[PDB]
Design a protein around this ligand. Structure first.
Ligand SMILES: [Zn+2]
Ligand SMILES: [Zn+2]
Ligand SMILES: [Zn+2]
Lengths: 9, 63
């Protein structure tokens, strides 16, 4: 999906 | 189920985790709509609550 600003930790 | 339009982000500079609805092209705050980053990795197309109201055929599509 289109996502933005994930912490991606 | 309450209406979730208050989960929409219309802020240009917002740094919160957010996911785009493929049904209305609005951005939704992930915490507000109850989708973790880990689940979102497996989402092909998100359809927001209001879109799934408008078309009860619709369901978020996973991958
Ligand atoms: Zn926001
Ligand atoms: Zn939508
Ligand atoms: Zn998957």
């Amino acid at each position: 999906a289109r996502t933005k600003q994930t912490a991606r930790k | 189920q309450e209406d979730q339009a208050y989960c929409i982000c219309r802020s240009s500079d917002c740094s919160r985790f957010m996911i785009g609805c493929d049904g209305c092209e609005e951005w939704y705050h992930g915490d507000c709509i109850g989708i973790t980053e880990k689940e979102a990795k497996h989402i092909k197309q998100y359809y927001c609550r209001r879109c799934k109201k408008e078309n009860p055929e619709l369901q978020t599509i996973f991958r």
